[PDB]
């Protein structure tokens, strides 16, 4: 649904891929673990490992990320955290 | 805040520390961002960096962890994911 | 820079008084948020910057206490 970016330390190209990848994942999958898995795998392929993704309606996180590889955004009411670490 | 461990790849001593640490965090802090932050910091100090913690009621994830440094458990209705990566 | 250890100690002694400003700002923020209609963009940005600076500052000091010697 509508993409709203709250935080990002990430290039413009990777930001757009984050939304696009999450958009496809959310359309294709219903289960959060599978939505997250789709998003992560796509980034590992195009932008190299090691990416991590959490997708959900209710969570907080405190993580460490690689510089220029962090975004936090919503698609409708669903929050997506997408970053590299390792 | 009763603790139930669902899955772990972690030594028994670190598993117990995770539950006790998360339990203390959950008693002290109301907001997941702060609970996660408490938990992460305690592990970086005692078990070296780089730790990551996600705390919440509704999420899925797909992550990569270091062997022997992974736990996923609940405190009551709140799920905590605690692992090392990087 | 065989003098800079003095500034190191001073910063450690000063921050216990300066750092509470952050919580004080939040405690008052509780009200500003409501009355200002959420128009707190400047406050949020500054808080985010502080988060960064505070974590970095502690990290440096934790290293300095051992590397400075």
């Amino acid at each position: 649904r509508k993409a709203v970016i709250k935080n990002a330390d990430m290039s413009e190209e990777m930001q757009q891929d984050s939304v696009e990848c999450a958009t496809q994942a959310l359309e294709k999958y219903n289960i959060e673990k599978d939505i997250a898995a789709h998003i992560k795998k796509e980034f590992d392929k195009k932008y190299n490992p090691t990416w991590h993704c959490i997708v959900g309606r209710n969570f907080g996180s405190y993580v460490t990320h690689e510089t220029k590889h962090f975004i936090y955004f919503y698609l409708g009411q669903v929050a997506i955290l997408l970053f590299k670490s390792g | 805040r009763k603790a139930v461990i669902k899955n772990a790849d972690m030594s028994e001593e670190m598993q117990q520390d995770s539950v006790e640490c998360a339990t203390q965090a959950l008693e002290k802090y109301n907001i997941e961002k702060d609970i996660a932050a408490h938990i992460k910091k305690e592990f970086d100090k005692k078990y070296n960096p780089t730790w990551h913690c996600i705390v919440g009621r509704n999420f899925g994830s797909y992550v990569t962890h270091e062997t022997k440094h992974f736990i996923y458990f609940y405190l009551g209705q709140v799920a905590i994911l605690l692992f090392k990566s990087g | 820079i065989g003098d800079a250890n003095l500034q190191y100690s001073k910063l450690q002694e000063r921050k216990p008084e300066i750092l509470p400003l952050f919580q004080e700002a939040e405690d008052k923020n509780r009200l500003l948020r409501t009355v200002a209609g959420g128009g707190l963009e400047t406050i949020s940005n500054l808080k985010a910057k502080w988060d960064k600076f505070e974590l970095m500052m502690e990290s440096h000091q934790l290293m300095i206490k051992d590397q400075i010697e």
Partner: peptide, 8 residues
């Protein structure tokens, strides 16, 4: 390494 801490 050049890493950063963050939270959501």
């Amino acid at each position: 390494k050049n890493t950063k801490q963050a939270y959501v």
